[PDB]
Amino acid sequence: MFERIDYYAGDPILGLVEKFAADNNPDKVNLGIGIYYDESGVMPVLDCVKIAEQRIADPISPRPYLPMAGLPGHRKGCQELLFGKDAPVLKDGLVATIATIGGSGALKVGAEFIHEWFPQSKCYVSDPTWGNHIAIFEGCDIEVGKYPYYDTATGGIKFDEMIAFFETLNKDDVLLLHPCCHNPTGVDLTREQWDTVLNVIQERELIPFMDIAYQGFGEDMDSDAYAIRKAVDMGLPLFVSNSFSKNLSLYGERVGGLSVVCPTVDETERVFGQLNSTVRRIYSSPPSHGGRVVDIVMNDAALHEQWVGEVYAMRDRIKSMRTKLKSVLEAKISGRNFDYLTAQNGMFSFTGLTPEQVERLQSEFGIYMISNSRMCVAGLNSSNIDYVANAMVDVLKD
Amino acid sequence: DPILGLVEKFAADNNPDKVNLGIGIYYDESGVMPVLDCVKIAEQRIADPISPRPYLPMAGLPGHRKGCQELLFGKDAPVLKDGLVATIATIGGSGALKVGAEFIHEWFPQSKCYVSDPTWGNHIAIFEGCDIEVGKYPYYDTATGGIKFDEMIAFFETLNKDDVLLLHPCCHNPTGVDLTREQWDTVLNVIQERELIPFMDIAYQGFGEDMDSDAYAIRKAVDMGLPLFVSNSFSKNLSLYGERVGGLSVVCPTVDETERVFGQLNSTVRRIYSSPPSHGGRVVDIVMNDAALHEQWVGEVYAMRDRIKSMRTKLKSVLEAKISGRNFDYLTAQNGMFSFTGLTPEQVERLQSEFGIYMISNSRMCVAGLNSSNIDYVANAMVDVLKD
Ligand SMILES: *Cc1c(COP(=O)(O)O)cnc(C)c1O
Ligand SMILES: *Cc1c(COP(=O)(O)O)cnc(C)c1O
Ligand SMILES: O=C(O)[C@@H](O)Cc1c[nH]c2ccccc12
Ligand SMILES: [Mg+2]
Ligand SMILES: [Mg+2]
Numbered sequence: 166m167f168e169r170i171d172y173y174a175g176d177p178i179l180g181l182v183e184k185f186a187a188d189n190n191p192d193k194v195n196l197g198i199g200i201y202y203d204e205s206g207v208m209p210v211l212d213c214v215k216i217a218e219q220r221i222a223d224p225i226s227p228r229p230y231l232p233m234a235g236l237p238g239h240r241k242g243c244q245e246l247l248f249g250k251d252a253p254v255l256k257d258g259l260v261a262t263i264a265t266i267g268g269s270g271a272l273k274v275g276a277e278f279i280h281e282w283f284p285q286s287k288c289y290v291s292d293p294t295w296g297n298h299i300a301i302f303e304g305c306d307i308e309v310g311k312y313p314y315y316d317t318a319t320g321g322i323k324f325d326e327m328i329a330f331f332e333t334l335n336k337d338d339v340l341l342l343h344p345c346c347h348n349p350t351g352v353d354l355t356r357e358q359w360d361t362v363l364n365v366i367q368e369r370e371l372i373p374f375m376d377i378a379y380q381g382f383g384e385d386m387d388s389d390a391y392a393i394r395k396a397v398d399m400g401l402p403l404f405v406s407n408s409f410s411k412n413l414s415l416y417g418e419r420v421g422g423l424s425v426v427c428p429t430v431d432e433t434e435r436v437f438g439q440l441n442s443t444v445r446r447i448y449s450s451p452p453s454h455g456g457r458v459v460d461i462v463m464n465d466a467a468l469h470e471q472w473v474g475e476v477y478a479m480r481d482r483i484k485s486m487r488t489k490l491k492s493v494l495e496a497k498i499s500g501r502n503f504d505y506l507t508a509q510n511g512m513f514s515f516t517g518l519t520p521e522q523v524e525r526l527q528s529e530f531g532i533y534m535i536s537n538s539r540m541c542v543a544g545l546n547s548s549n550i551d552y553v554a555n556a557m558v559d560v561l562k563d
Numbered sequence: 564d565p566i567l568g569l570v571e572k573f574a575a576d577n578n579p580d581k582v583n584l585g586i587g588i589y590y591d592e593s594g595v596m597p598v599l600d601c602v603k604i605a606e607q608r609i610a611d612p613i614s615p616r617p618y619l620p621m622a623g624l625p626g627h628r629k630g631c632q633e634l635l636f637g638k639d640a641p642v643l644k645d646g647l648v649a650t651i652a653t654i655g656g657s658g659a660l661k662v663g664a665e666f667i668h669e670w671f672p673q674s675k676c677y678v679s680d681p682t683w684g685n686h687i688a689i690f691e692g693c694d695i696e697v698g699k700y701p702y703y704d705t706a707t708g709g710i711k712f713d714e715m716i717a718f719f720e721t722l723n724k725d726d727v728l729l730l731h732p733c734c735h736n737p738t739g740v741d742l743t744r745e746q747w748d749t750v751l752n753v754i755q756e757r758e759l760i761p762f763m764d765i766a767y768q769g770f771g772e773d774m775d776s777d778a779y780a781i782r783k784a785v786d787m788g789l790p791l792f793v794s795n796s797f798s799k800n801l802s803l804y805g806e807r808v809g810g811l812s813v814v815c816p817t818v819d820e821t822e823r824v825f826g827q828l829n830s831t832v833r834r835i836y837s838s839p840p841s842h843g844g845r846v847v848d849i850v851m852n853d854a855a856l857h858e859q860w861v862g863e864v865y866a867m868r869d870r871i872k873s874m875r876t877k878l879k880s881v882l883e884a885k886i887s888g889r890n891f892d893y894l895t896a897q898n899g900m901f902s903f904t905g906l907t908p909e910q911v912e913r914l915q916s917e918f919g920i921y922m923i924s925n926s927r928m929c930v931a932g933l934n935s936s937n938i939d940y941v942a943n944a945m946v947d948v949l950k951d
Contacts, residue, residue, distance in 0.1 A: 166790055167815050170670055173826030176833060179621065208615035215613050222610035225603050227596035228805040269837040304834030417616035417841030446692030447661050447835065448654035453805030454842035
């Protein structure tokens with residue numbers, strides 16, 4: 166009956182968290198999952214979230230179904246963050262937006278929409294990409310391919326090879342792009358590079374699906390959203406999935422959004438209706454709590470401002486560890502370049518360590534990373550940094 | 564939803580004495596959605612201290628899963644002691660149905676699903692959303708006001724091995740009309756005989772008789788050693804529609820087959836939404852696995868159960884005081900918050916335009932919309948349309 170069902174190998178990222186918790190080392194360090202940890206080494210509750218949550222709890226409200234699209238303020242908050250407050254596209258009523266179960270739920274709903282309305286469309290993800298990108302899209306019965314992205318030889322982007330790749334594709338083929346803070350390489354495109362990319366997307370009439378999960382961790386909110394906002398300004402059929410998991414430090418509550426930028430108000434209504442309908446088929450409506458937190462924080466002027474402040478402090482703390490690590494690494498190893506540490510953006514960096522070197526760090530030192538050498542920089546702090554440096558140089562000499 | 568056109572017609576009605584019985588939500592005596600005291604206590608515990616918010620395991624919280632398992636199958640049911648049930652926390656019962664269907668589609672691609680005539684609207688949409696061919700088995704008989712039982716079994720016999728039946732264990736939506744224990748016993752015997760897959764969808768456990776009775780069809784199917792899928796929802800019994808709390812349980816012949824299935828359930832969650840929501844999971848975890856809170860919760864559910872039966876009684880007694888030839892026992896014979904009132908689509912219309920009392924044109928009424936300040940208004944309005 167069930168003997169035919171295959172064993173599930175386990176999620177590489179989420180299985181690793183349990184190996185970390187199950188490990189009983191004094192100096193254990195988790196650079197595996199894309200979570201931000203404070204200077205103390207613990208996952209913070211943002212102050213703005215704390216105020217918001219005290220509001221929700223005072224008093225305790227009845228809990229009806231949210232609209233399928235989630236809360237108006239949650240939707241507005243997604244939109245204003247991605248496109249800009251008072252953006253003409255928003256004022257023209259041209260973006261259809263739903264609350265989703267994290268960035269993951271946004272990717273699902275989006276891909277399902279794409280599958281249904283563009284059944285011949287093939288999706289293409291970065292080489293490499295965040296693993297779950299492939300799983301979500303194939304889950305909708307869409308054929309998934311890679312586009313050359315990361316120059317595994319140089320630690321930069323195979324830009325020409327990538328561009329030449331996008332010229333070969335079919336109309337309405339879907340590119341799954343990282344607007345900023347690449348997962349897992351940390352290697353982003355320059356503005357100028359985005360311009361050329363987005364020019365090709367137009368000429369070839371491909372569908373951009375931008376997946377953004379670390380807005381505010383790269384440069385700043387508006388700057389990180391460049392690729393999104395440019396695409397809008399060019400008039401492209403845009404899909405955006407956004408996540409508040411990371412910048413609201415609210416991973417567990419499953420907060421995200423999906424926005425579809427449309428040619429007309431009436432097409433917006435149609436797509437929005439379709440989005441609502443896709444949601445109905447998957448989970449009916451999104452969770453209330455996470456929704457309210459997003460709503461309350463995004464649309465309270467003082468909380469929004471405080472939140473922006475808190476995201477940048479996170480961004481700054483990550484950036485300072487990049488340079489603190491680079492400097493203590495620099496001194497210990499002569500024969501190697503460490504420029505990638507301060508050149509990459511976001512929570513992640515490709516260290517360029519072999520799967521073996523990654524696993525020696527795990528076994529001997531209790532330092533956790535993905536086998537592809539991805540390191541979550543956020544797990545570093547002034548306590549563990551001399552320890553991780555010392556460990557890295559000990560695995561690099563060997 | 565088709566309900567949303569009705570909700571739109573209802574808001575469009577200016578009648579100040581209007582009543583919405585087309586709702587699919589429990590209201591208390593004051594005609595509002597209640598916050599349960601056990602939920603209120605739970606959420607006060609979650610609020611102090613505000614705790615960091617890691618991802619949940621893709622399966623949800625251990626306690627959420629254990630909660631679902633003990634509620635469905637019985638505290639220390641052998642099937643649990645034997646570890647023969649794969650259980651994940653889900654985005655309500657909706658998300659439980661989704662994971663279930665996609666699972667079935669991936670591994671039993673040839674399987675067709677059959678839902679009751681009639682059923683909860685989304686049953687069809689969810690399974691059709693997975694590229695499963697969905698049909699209807701006969702259930703409700705308009706002529707008797709009960710179950711086309713013989714015809715239903717007859718339909719079940721014509722179905723292939725591994726075909727899926729969507730079965731309401733109790734408190735049938737939208738009719739209120741339930742199978743007896745005897746009727747269940749033969750159903751599960753047909754299902755076993757034909758090696759069909761029982762998919763049971765339980766959203767109103769505790770609104771029918773009690774927790775254990777409501778779960779009869781579930782627990783028997785386990786005793787018989789059937790390949791049972793269960794989707795359960797706390798939306799209603801926990802009054803937590805918006806936090807999206809349910810479970811999906813799959814009962815397997817072997818400990819090893821459970822690990823395989825539990826594995827794919829996880830892999831399915833991974834492709835849809837990565838992991839379920841922290842808050843709702845915690846409320847379920849606290850309320851199910853705190854002994855006193857569990858008792859209080861059970862009590863509060865039975866208070867709702869009893870309020871529904873209190874309104875079913877009052878309505879019938881007003882009706883029977885005026886009409887003699889009909890047997891209204893079916894109003895009290897039905898269970899949960901839904902009632903096929905057996906009014907003609909024309910009679911439903913009459914109630915709308917004359918009284919602003921809103922039912923679904925298939926005679927469906929949500930009994931929980933009745934409270935002491937509209938019961939007499941609504942009962943009397945009904946006598947008029949039946950007298951016309
Ligand atoms: C972490 C991540 C996600 C997942 O976001 P959730 O809010 O957890 O669903 C999606 N895309 C990328 C690129 C990510 O890094
Ligand atoms: C309400 C209901 C569901 C779905 O419950 P949710 O928790 O809101 O997803 C499923 N089946 C039936 C019969 C229902 O009444
Ligand atoms: O990128 C990271 O570091 C994580 O956010 C990924 C991640 C977190 N939870 C998951 C569940 C399934 C698949 C991937 C994930
Ligand atoms: Mg599908
Ligand atoms: Mg507000």
